[PDB]
Amino acid sequence: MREIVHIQAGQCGNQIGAKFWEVISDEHGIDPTGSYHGDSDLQLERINVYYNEATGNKYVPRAILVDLEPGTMDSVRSGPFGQIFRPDNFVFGQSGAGNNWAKGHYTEGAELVDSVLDVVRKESESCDCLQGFQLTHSLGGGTGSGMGTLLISKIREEYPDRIMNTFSVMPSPKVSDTVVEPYNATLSVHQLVENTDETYSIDNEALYDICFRTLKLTTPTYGDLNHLVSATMSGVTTCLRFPGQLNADLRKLAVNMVPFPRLHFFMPGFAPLTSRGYRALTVPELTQQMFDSKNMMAACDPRHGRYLTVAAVFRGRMSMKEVDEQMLNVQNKNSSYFVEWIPNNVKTAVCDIPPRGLKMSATFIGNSTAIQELFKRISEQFTAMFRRKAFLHWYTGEGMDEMEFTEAESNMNDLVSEYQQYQDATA
C-alpha cells in the first residue's frame, strides 16, 4: 500500500477523469506543466499516491487514458492540463464502441485491451508499493461500460491481491436518450458486483436534479454535472492524498465500508453544493447538508433505508470539538437510520486544506441499503425491453447470447434482494 494507478475509459470516463486531475493538481499545487508551486508541505507528504516524480523534480499523474475513438482524448490533450499526462499513457482506437457494451467488452475493446495493460504494467513497475486501481467511466456507453469492466477483470487476473475501486456513472433518461443504456448498465453492474472492492455510484439523475432544483440551472450542461463529480472525487479521495488516521488507504477504507463483499456500492454526498460561478458554512450546516437527500450523488432517499457504514470527511479550518459534536448529534438524533448490529459505523476525518474557492466543505460516503432504489430503476428499464427482447440484435450481432442478459438481470435482482435483507435485519 502507497501508489494508486488511475485509468479513465470512454467519453464520460475521460471527461470526469480529466476534471479530477485538474482539481487535485491545483490542490497539491502542481501547474499544467507538472512543476510544484505551493505554499504548504502538506501538499507533497502524500503526493506519490497519485503522482510519479520525474527527473528535474516534475510531477507526472499516474494516469492511463483509454478510448475506442480519438475524440475526447484529443480535446483532453488540447485541454489546460493535457500536458501534465504522460503521452505514452494515451491508449486509443479509431473504430468507436457505438454505445454497445458487446463492442467494448468482446469485439472492438478486445483489439485494444492488451496495449492498455502494457501501460498498466509499466506504471505498476515504477511503484514501491502499489495499493490498487482507480477507474472513471460511465455504465451507459460502450467503451467505459464494456471495455472498462473487461479492463477491471483483466487487471484483477494480473493483480489479484490489489484493491479495485471505481467511480461509475449511472444512466438517466433526463441526461441521455440512448435506448440501450439500461442493457449496458445492467451488464456493467454484474461485472462491478464480482470484480470491484469499492464503487462510488455517481448518478446522472441526481447530478441533473441538483443542477436544476438546487443550483437553479435551467439548461445544465455536462460540465455542470462534472463540476459536482470533480468536487465529489476530490472529497472521497482526500484521506488517501493528505496525512491522516482514518481511511488513509484503499484497503483500510474497504474494511471500514464493506460488511458484505457484494454490498460495496457507495452513495456519495457533498456540502456546499455549488455551480461554477463569499458566505462560509458553519460546522452544523455542513453536517445537516452532507446527510440530506438533496446533497446525495445517487438518486436514492437515505430515509428509505438504513446505513450499514458511513465515512464523513470535513475539509478546512474548523472546530474538531464541534465537528465531533455535530457528527454525534446527527447519529443520536436519527439512530433508527443506522443498523444497530454494526456498532459505531460512522467514522469521521478532518483535513486542514479545503477545496478551491471554499473556506469549508464536507464529503459524505455512505453504504446505505437505499442504493437498491437506483438498481431497481435500471432493472425496471432493462426488464421492460428484455421481456420483448427489443434492441438485442445489436448485442447478438456481436456474438452475445440472451443467457448473459438473463444472468446479469438475475445478479442485479439478487443484489437488490441482499440490500433488502440487511434493511429488515435486527439485532
Binding site: Q94, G98, N99, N100, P173, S176, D177, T178, V179, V180, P182, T218, T219, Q381, A384, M385, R387, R388, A390, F391, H393, W394, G397
Partner: protein, 440 residues
C-alpha cells in the same frame, strides 16, 4: 475516415442523386467543376465533408458516388449537365436496353450483364476509403432497374462487404406520377429480396411529396424536378449528421441504434419542417417550437399513414441551423406534457436530438423559402405498415387473376417467387402488429 459511398440506381435514383449532389455542393461551397476555395487542405484532408467527397491533387472534390441505369438517356443528362466536371466518366454507368418496368429484367436478364462492371467501380471507390462506413442506395420500388437491379446489387454487396452498413432511400409508388401498372409486383419483389440485405430504409411516398408541393408550395401539377428538390432537403437533413461536425451533432448510427428494435423493423418515418414558399415566409419566422410541433402533423410526412393511430418505438429530432438546446428541450417538454405521443410499453419514451449549426441551403430557382432553422424527425411508428398494406392490397387484386405474371415467368421467374415474396410481406405486416401489442 468514416466514408460513405452513394449508389444511384435507375431514373428515380439518378435524378434524386443529381438534386442531392447539387445541394451538397451548395452546402459545402463546392463549384460545378469540383473546386472548393474554403478547403485549405489540398489533395486531401480529414474534414467532415470528406465522408461524401474525395479529393484530387488538383483540388477537385469528387462525390463518392456511382450512378447506374440500364439505359443511357437519364445518366447522359448528368454527363452533359452543369456538374459534368464533378464526376469521373467511370462513376456514370449505362446499359443500352432498360428493364422495361420488370423486376425480372433488372434482377436477371439485363442486370446480370452489367452487375460485375458496377461492382468493380464500387470497389475502386471503396479502395480510396481509409475507413468505409457503408452505402446509401437510392432507387424506386416500381421501375425494373430500381427494383430488380437494386435487389441484385444489395445481395452482391452483402457477399462482397459483409455486414458493412447498407442504407436505402426507396421511392414508394403513387398513381399521380406512376409509370406502370405492375409497380405493386416490383415493390413487393424488391422489398422481400432486399429485407435481409438492408440495415435501415427511408421510404419516400411520391404521393406524400406530391401533396406537400401542391399544398405547402402551391404548385398546380408538380414535376419530378419539384419532387426531387423536396427529397434533396429530407436526404440532406439525414446526411448532415455525417457531412458536418459540431458539439450537438449526433451521428446517423446513434439514431439508427434507437430506430431499429428488431432487424426487420428498419423503416423509419421521415417528417420535415418547415416546407414554406418565399411569399408565405416573408415577415413570418418559425420558431424551434413551431417547426418541432409541425413534425407531429401528418401533412409533413414522407409516407402517408397515421402515427396517431399507431404506436411509437422511437423519435429522433435532427435540427438544422439557428437552434439552441434550451429551446429544443423546452419544445420537447411541451409535446411530452401535451401527451399526444403513445409509445409501446417495452421502450423508453426519450427523444434523441442532433443539431447542426449550418442552416438549410436552397437551390437557386427553387420553390422552397430559405429558413433560419429546419428539423427532420425520424420516428419508428407501427403506422408505416399502412404503406405495406396498401401496396400489398394492390398486389393481391392482380396476383389472384395472375395478371401480368407471364411477363415475369417469361424472364425466368417462378410463381413461387411471387407467393414467397407476398408471404414475407404478410409476415412483416404481422411483425408490425406484434410490436404494437402491450406486454403481459
Amino acid at each position: 475516415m468514416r466514408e460513405c459511398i452513394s449508389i444511384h440506381v435507375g431514373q428515380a435514383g439518378v435524378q434524386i442523386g443529381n438534386a442531392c449532389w447539387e445541394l451538397y455542393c451548395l452546402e459545402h461551397g463546392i463549384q460545378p467543376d469540383g473546386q472548393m476555395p474554403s478547403d485549405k487542405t489540398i489533395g486531401g484532408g480529414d474534414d467532415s465533408f470528406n465522408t461524401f467527397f474525395s479529393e484530387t491533387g488538383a483540388g477537385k472534390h469528387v462525390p463518392r458516388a456511382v450512378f447506374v441505369d440500364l439505359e443511357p438517356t437519364v445518366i447522359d443528362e448528368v454527363r452533359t449537365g452543369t456538374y459534368r466536371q464533378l464526376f469521373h466518366p467511370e462513376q456514370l454507368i449505362t446499359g443500352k436496353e432498360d428493364a422495361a418496368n420488370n423486376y425480372a429484367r433488372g434482377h436477371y436478364t439485363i442486370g446480370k450483364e452489367i452487375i460485375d462492371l458496377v461492382l468493380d467501380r464500387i470497389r475502386k471507390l471503396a479502395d480510396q476509403c481509409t475507413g468505409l462506413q457503408g452505402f446509401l442506395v437510392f432507387h424506386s420500388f416500381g421501375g425494373g432497374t430500381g427494383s430488380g437491379f437494386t435487389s441484385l446489387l444489395m445481395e452482391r454487396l452483402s457477399v462482397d462487404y459483409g455486414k458493412k452498413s447498407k442504407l436505402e432511400f426507396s421511392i414508394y409508388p403513387a398513381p399521380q406520377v406512376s409509370t406502370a401498372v405492375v409497380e405493386p409486383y416490383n415493390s413487393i419483389l424488391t422489398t422481400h429480396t432486399t429485407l435481409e440485405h438492408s440495415d435501415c430504409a427511408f421510404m419516400v411516398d411520391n404521393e406524400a411529396i406530391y401533396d406537400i408541393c401542391r399544398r405547402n408550395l402551391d404548385i398546380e401539377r408538380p414535376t419530378y424536378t419539384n419532387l426531387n428538390r423536396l427529397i434533396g432537403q429530407i436526404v440532406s437533413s439525414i446526411t448532415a449528421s455525417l457531412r458536418f461536425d459540431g458539439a450537438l451533432n449526433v451521428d446517423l448510427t446513434e439514431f439508427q441504434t434507437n430506430l431499429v428494435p428488431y432487424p426487420r423493423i428498419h423503416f423509419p418515418l421521415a417528417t420535415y419542417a418547415p416546407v414554406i414558399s418565399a411569399e408565405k415566409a416573408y415577415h413570418e419566422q418559425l420558431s424551434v417550437a413551431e417547426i418541432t410541433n409541425a413534425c407531429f402533423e401528418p401533412a409533413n410526412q414522407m409516407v402517408k399513414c397515421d402515427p396517431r393511430h399507431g404506436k411509437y418505438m422511437a423519435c429522433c429530432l435532427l435540427y438544422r441551423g439557428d437552434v439552441v438546446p434550451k429551446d429544443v428541450n423546452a419544445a420537447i417538454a411541451t409535446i411530452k406534457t401535451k401527451r399526444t405521443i403513445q409509445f409501446v410499453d417495452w421502450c423508453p419514451t426519450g427523444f434523441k436530438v442532433g443539431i447542426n449549426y449550418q442552416p438549410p441551403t436552397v437551390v437557386p430557382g427553387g420553390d422552397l423559402a430559405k429558413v433560419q432553422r429546419a428539423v427532420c424527425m425520424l420516428s419508428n411508428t407501427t403506422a408505416i405498415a399502412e404503406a405495406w398494406a396498401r401496396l400489398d392490397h394492390k398486389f393481391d387484386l392482380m396476383y389472384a387473376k395472375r395478371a401480368f405474371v407471364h411477363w415475369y415467368v417469361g424472364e425466368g421467374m417462378e410463381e413461387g417467387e411471387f407467393s414467397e415474396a407476398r408471404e414475407d410481406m404478410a409476415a412483416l405486416e404481422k411483425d408490425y402488429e406484434e410490436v404494437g401489442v402491450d406486454s403481459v
